[PDB]
Amino acid sequence: MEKALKIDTPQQGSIQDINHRVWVLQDQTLIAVPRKDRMSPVTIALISCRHVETLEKDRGNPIYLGLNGLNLCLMCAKVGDQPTLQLKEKDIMDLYNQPEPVKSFLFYHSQSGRNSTFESVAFPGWFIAVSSEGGCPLILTQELGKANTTDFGLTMLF
Numbered sequence: 001m002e003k004a005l006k007i008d009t010p011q012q013g014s015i016q017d018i019n020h021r022v023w024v025l026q027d028q029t030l031i032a033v034p035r036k037d038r039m040s041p042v043t044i045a046l047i048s049c050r051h052v053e054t055l056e057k058d059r060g061n062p063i064y065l066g067l068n069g070l071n072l073c074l075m076c077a078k079v080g081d082q083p084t085l086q087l088k089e090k091d092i093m094d095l096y097n098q099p100e101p102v103k104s105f106l107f108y109h110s111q112s113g114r115n116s117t118f119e120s121v122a123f124p125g126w127f128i129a130v131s132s133e134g135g136c137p138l139i140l141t142q143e144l145g146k147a148n149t150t151d152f153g154l155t156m157l158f
Helices: 092-097
Strands: 011-014 023-026 029-032 043-048 062-068 076-078 083-085 107-111 116-120 127-129 139-141 155-157
Touching: 043 092, 043 155, 062 092, 116 127
Parallel strands: none
Antiparallel strands: 011 043, 011 155, 023 029, 043 062, 062 107, 076 083, 083 139, 107 116, 127 139
8 A cells, every 4th residue: 555645546637738749549659640630539647656665766756657548558668679668558557556566667757847757667768758849659768859858747637
């Protein structure tokens, strides 16, 4: 069970509100559709990792998030070259329910001036990119040349 917090309840909402970038799971990949007739709204569920007792603390607080609709959540994968995101098949309420804080799916949450960032716990050095620039797919980046969006908020509701 959790220690003593006031944000244990799952907070589900969205991120499209940032720049009208709707997110759609398309052919096992999340892609932003900022201008498409075939768009589909989704939801983003965010919850703390109650089994943080065995996790790191120095680097920052690891938590988990997922899409609410087709049973899909963040998941680190590798293209046999470098790490990548795979939000397709994963459950968030399960990792919360059972003491299985799988770092490969957890992300350290941070903030830097009204902005929030999320770094891969199993593989630090990379940040999730919300893709609010042109309309790129949801991927992880380690360094960007002001071409992606790593620094942003969320529109999670409770």
